[PDB]
Design a protein around this ligand. Structure first.
Ligand SMILES: [Mg+2]
Ligand SMILES: [Mg+2]
Ligand SMILES: [Mg+2]
Ligand SMILES: [Mg+2]
Ligand SMILES: [Mg+2]
Ligand SMILES: [Mg+2]
Ligand SMILES: [Mg+2]
Ligand SMILES: [Mg+2]
Ligand SMILES: [Mg+2]
Ligand SMILES: [Mg+2]
Ligand SMILES: [Mg+2]
Ligand SMILES: [Mg+2]
Ligand SMILES: [Mg+2]
Ligand SMILES: [Mg+2]
Ligand SMILES: [Mg+2]
Ligand SMILES: [Mg+2]
Ligand SMILES: [Mg+2]
Ligand SMILES: [Mg+2]
Ligand SMILES: [Mg+2]
Ligand SMILES: [Mg+2]
Ligand SMILES: [Mg+2]
Ligand SMILES: [Mg+2]
Ligand SMILES: [Mg+2]
Ligand SMILES: [Mg+2]
Ligand SMILES: [Mg+2]
Ligand SMILES: [Mg+2]
Ligand SMILES: [Mg+2]
Ligand SMILES: [Mg+2]
Ligand SMILES: [Mg+2]
Ligand SMILES: [Mg+2]
Ligand SMILES: [Mg+2]
Ligand SMILES: [Mg+2]
Ligand code: NA
Length: 414
RNA sequence: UUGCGACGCGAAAGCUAGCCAGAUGAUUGUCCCACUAGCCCAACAAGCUAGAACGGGACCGGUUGUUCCCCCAACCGUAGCCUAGGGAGGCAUGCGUGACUGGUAACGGUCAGGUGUGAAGCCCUCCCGACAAUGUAGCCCGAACCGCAAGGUUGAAGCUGAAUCCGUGAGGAGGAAGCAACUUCACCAGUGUCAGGUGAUAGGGAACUAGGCUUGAGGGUAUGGUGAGCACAUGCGAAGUGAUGUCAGAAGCCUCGUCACAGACCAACAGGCCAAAGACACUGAUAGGCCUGAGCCAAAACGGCAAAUGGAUAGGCUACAUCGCUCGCUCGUCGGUGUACGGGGACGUCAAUCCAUCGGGGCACAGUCACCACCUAACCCCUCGUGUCAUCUGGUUGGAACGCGGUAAGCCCGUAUCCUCGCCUUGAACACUCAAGGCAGGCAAACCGUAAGGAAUGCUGAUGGGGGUGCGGGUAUGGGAUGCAGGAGAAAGCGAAUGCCGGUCUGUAAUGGACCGGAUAGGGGUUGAGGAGACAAUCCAACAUCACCCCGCCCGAAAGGGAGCAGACUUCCUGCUGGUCUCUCUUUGCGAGAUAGCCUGUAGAACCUCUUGAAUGGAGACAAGGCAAAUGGCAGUGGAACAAACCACUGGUGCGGUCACCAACCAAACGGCCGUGAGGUAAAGAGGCUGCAAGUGCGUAUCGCAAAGGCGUUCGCGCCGGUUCCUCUUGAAAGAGGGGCUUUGAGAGGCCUGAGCCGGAUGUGGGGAAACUCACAAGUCCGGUUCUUAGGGGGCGGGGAUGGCAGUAAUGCCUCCCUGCUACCCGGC
DNA sequence: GGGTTGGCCGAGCGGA
């Protein structure tokens, strides 16, 4: 099946996008209508449901037996006409960073319809979106937001004034009428969705279809900031909801404040007064964990000290849990944490920050090894827990050698 | 489950505490006199010894008084003893292992030799003994060239040290002879050589570690301690007061300075220098090398200035306190602080050395800070006194984990005695009949299991098994954690108590203490303990908690076993019990909250059927920000040369809108209007049936959480919390604000293990001068307390599952569950 | 503005 079921869907996605590169929204709505009423679209929809850890919804359906795939997909073969979405189930997943962050879970049939119209929406939200919008799109990392911050703010390639903005309104605070007016999908399905209390009201508009909506609602910013015409003055860089704007002066960024607040005025959104601030590089703004400053005609994207303190909080808590552990288990928990904070900051100025990070986790590991055996000397723990692994002594681990990854040895790529 | 630890006793023996009294040694540099000793052997004295004998004078050495010098002052002394520490024996004991032996068995006794332990409650003698082990973060060494390996030559931090010389002497000056680790790297302004130097390191060394007592008593005095442990919203508790803090973390500490680890380093880059920078050559004039810097001056190149903001200082094997990035307590070296530390002189002081306030990181076995009450007196001050310290001896009161004692109910074994006793299948004969065999059961264990124990095999299989009782032999063994009550048995104690039971007074939070009263044992005979008696002649006496025989009574049939109050400790049996936690359902709070159905309108061009009627059926091009009830698992073109597989490219599927059709049906023009064809043909309405829209179902099925109250009360409420939901904020388990509530039951099921702490009575050791602290199973014992829900594995007995193997079958056997026991092992304290 | 390696004082009694 799936050796062609992805293929026909993706070809028809290509045809939707080729429709939107000319006007032809009749062609677009025809191919959306057709792809939604395709067997392959429905089969893909139930695969995307079954591969996201389905659990108890209100309208409980199963996942298993490899026939309820065919049962449910023939069920939504009919189901466009009498489709009534049932409301959500208020499910708390206990995040390991502070709460049980709530996440309203739809019905499996409702999330299958969401996956259907998600593969309908995607090739329109590719082409009609921005070109400096990096949130939640295809093929785009948050590192590319830093790359756009680089080739915007480089060797005097801006003029030193940047607006650090952010958008209020927690939920999909968008006026429902605006969504129903201009979104390239069938207004009856979206009409039934927005009535239903669509996503549970602790949602932060960054459940598959809601990023497609929250990208489509924020795609006029780049065009309406080509109302200003200078050389490299206005550049907008936006990751999913958190954007910063460039400029050349304090009052022209206030033109940009009034412009963007008129833009979001039509929708249900307002920029804040707190989180919005104008700032002069070099005084720095925080953007996706990376501090951007200048430090005297350098650029120096550095990972900010609120993305370092969060990483030390993660390792501090990983060892406050493993307080009586085995040494190889301590390597096993602490090693992908450091590798994930390595591959994420490996394109920026981070090597100095990596040596300070390995320093601080080393002191945590030393306090680990010394709190292990209280009344026992120090040369014992140094040669029992730490290995001369090379030129380096003090390399934590045991055993072919099992040992932590020094984040400082992770080879920053230009 | 920790080497032992329970309980009574100290009859006796040996450790041990308090007190009393004696004896002995000692009371710690040298000399001179003072006093006394062997002192006139002439009481003169010149001369001999010892001196807490507690005197004075003059001197030696050491340490402190901040490096060196010269004074001065205080303190210490080469003596005796004790301990830590080391060595060597015996001795005792724990666990094994073989050899022998008792006994019917259960179970023992004895030697050997293998390994432990001998102690903070628990071995004896001897020797070395304040010298040493032992340790170390700072300091010092850790070379210098001959050269075959490093062999030697020398050096060498340093150790030890004679000869000599001075002084009455303590001592002072020299250091011959001897001993001694020295191993491996890196940097020097390119490379190589040679010279001249610096920094890690194996080890070595210095330094300390390396003790204590030898003058007491009172009074004042704290820099020295204590005032529980826990939780915290409230508190429990006999056990200060009040703040403040709990993981987005107080106090303390390690770092570091706004880009906030090594006041880092190397590379890059930028600015400057230099002529290969100690020489001798090679190479390079510019990247050739070096300096400085994510700040600045520099420049022959000596290096300096500020380093977030202020601020301080000279010289420490000094003493005390703290700290060196977090368990408590005692220590060793080294380093930083803070307080205290005579007179003069010389040398000369400051380096990013240190402190303080902010600020960035961190570190977390939860305390901290202030006050109050009380304790102790080292030091100092004051008063009084002449001793003090160690050991041994004797007395006396005590104690114990050391020494002694107790078999009895439990269990095992033997003995006599009463009761019970199979099961199958076949040949069954006279019908119970009986056989033959296997089972079930009784005994050995080869072998396995560290271990609980099990099992091959063999042995027996009513000639034998099992249960009950009465005896006899053996062995029961030692932990506070949930009490209590009853029974079996009950050591020591008492023929009148140390116990018991009443009574009186009194103390603690609780255990307690003193005193008065009361009960409490069949007989005889015997040995004849032991005292009597002028005596050994009397030659006794019955109790010596009763040594041994018969009757009174019980029990048993017998042998006999028993029988007065308490009756400790360990056991065994029976009953009633406690606490807390996990899971499931229930009920209530907060939030969410539907589909099917029922109903009222709406739409159906893209859903059907039917009735209809200018009112039908099948198909093309063009478009398409209008819509939809099968749909793109569709079709076409091309690549394969069209062909077989696969791959590129195109497609709006339908309704609607416009041109444009094909089938099927005709208004008008037309000879009495019989006939004709050029020409015209797109609705409405009823049934279901799907959707929509509201309502009812319904605050319901169901889902996510949660069940926590206290205090003031002025009775209205308020504050502190808890719980659910919403909103702001934060990277974040933090916070801010708001709404509600402030709240029930049952079910089975775990589990009894530990941490301590306080008081009292006793012991021991480290620290301390002492209070007091840290430990000895919470020291132990009793008493009072909170807290932890209290760990895995394995085995044996019973009832089932009970699928198979073996099976004529009895049934066992590998596999599951329920249930009883188990210290049987590895934790753990 | 990338590239390397540091950190370790010992004894003893008793515990979370
Ligand atoms: Mg005695
Ligand atoms: Mg004497
Ligand atoms: Mg002197
Ligand atoms: Mg002086
Ligand atoms: Mg010996
Ligand atoms: Mg001495
Ligand atoms: Mg050296
Ligand atoms: Mg050498
Ligand atoms: Mg050394
Ligand atoms: Mg000495
Ligand atoms: Mg005081
Ligand atoms: Mg500083
Ligand atoms: Mg800086
Ligand atoms: Mg500097
Ligand atoms: Mg000194
Ligand atoms: Mg006093
Ligand atoms: Mg006693
Ligand atoms: Mg005892
Ligand atoms: Mg006991
Ligand atoms: Mg025991
Ligand atoms: Mg008790
Ligand atoms: Mg009893
Ligand atoms: Mg007795
Ligand atoms: Mg009496
Ligand atoms: Mg009484
Ligand atoms: Mg009761
Ligand atoms: Mg009940
Ligand atoms: Mg005591
Ligand atoms: Mg002990
Ligand atoms: Mg006690
Ligand atoms: Mg313990
Ligand atoms: Mg203990
Ligand atoms: Na426990």
């Amino acid at each position: 099946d799936w050796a062609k079921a992805n293929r026909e869907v993706k070809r028809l996605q290509v045809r939707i996008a080729k429709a939107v590169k000319e006007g032809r929204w009749g062609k677009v709505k025809a191919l959306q209508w057709l792809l939604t009423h395709s067997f392959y679209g429905k089969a893909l929809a139930v695969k995307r449901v079954t591969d996201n850890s389905g659990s108890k919804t209100p309208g409980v359906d199963g996942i298993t037996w490899s026939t309820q795939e065919q049962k449910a997909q023939a069920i939504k073969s009919l189901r466009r006409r009498g489709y009534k979405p049932q409301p959500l189930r208020r499910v708390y997943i206990p995040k390991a960073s502070g709460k049980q962050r709530p996440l309203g879970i739809p019905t499996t049939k409702d999330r299958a319809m969401q996956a259907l119209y998600a593969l309908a929406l995607e090739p329109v939200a590719e082409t009609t979106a921005d070109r400096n919008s990096y949130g939640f799109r295809q093929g785009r990392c948050t590192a590319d937001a830093a790359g756009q911050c680089f080739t915007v703010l480089g060797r005097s390639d801006c003029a030193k004034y940047i607006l650090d903005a952010d958008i209020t309104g927690c939920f999909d605070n968008i006026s429902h009428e605006w969504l129903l007016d201009n979104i390239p999908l069938d207004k009856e399905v979206l009409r039934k969705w927005l009535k239903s209390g669509f996503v549970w009201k602790q949602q932060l508009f960054p459940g598959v279809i809601s990023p497609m909506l929250a990208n489509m609602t924020l795609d006029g910013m780049e065009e309406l900031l080509k109302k200003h015409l200078r050389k490299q003055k206005v550049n907008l860089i936006r990751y999913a909801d958190d954007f910063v704007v460039t400029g050349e002066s304090k009052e022209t960024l206030e033109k940009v404040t009034t412009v963007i607040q008129e833009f979001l005025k039509e929708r249900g959104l307002t920029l804040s007064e707190e989180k919005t601030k104008v700032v002069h590089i070099e005084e720095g703004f925080d953007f996706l964990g990376w501090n951007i400053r200048k430090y005297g005609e350098k650029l120096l994207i550095k990972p900010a000290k609120k993305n370092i303190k969060a990483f030390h909080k993660k390792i501090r808590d990983a060892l406050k849990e493993l307080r009586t552990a085995t040494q190889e288990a301590v390597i096993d928990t602490l090693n992908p944490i450091i590798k994930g904070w390595a591959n994420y900051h490996r394109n920026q100025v981070s090597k100095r920050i990596f040596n300070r990070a390995d320093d601080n986790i080393w002191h945590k590991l030393w306090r680990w090894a010394k709190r292990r055996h209280p009344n026992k000397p120090a040369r014992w723990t140094k040669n029992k827990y730490f290995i001369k692994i090379g030129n380096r002594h003090w390399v934590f681990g045991t055993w072919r050698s099992r040992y932590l990854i020094k984040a400082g040895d992770t080879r920053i790529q230009r």
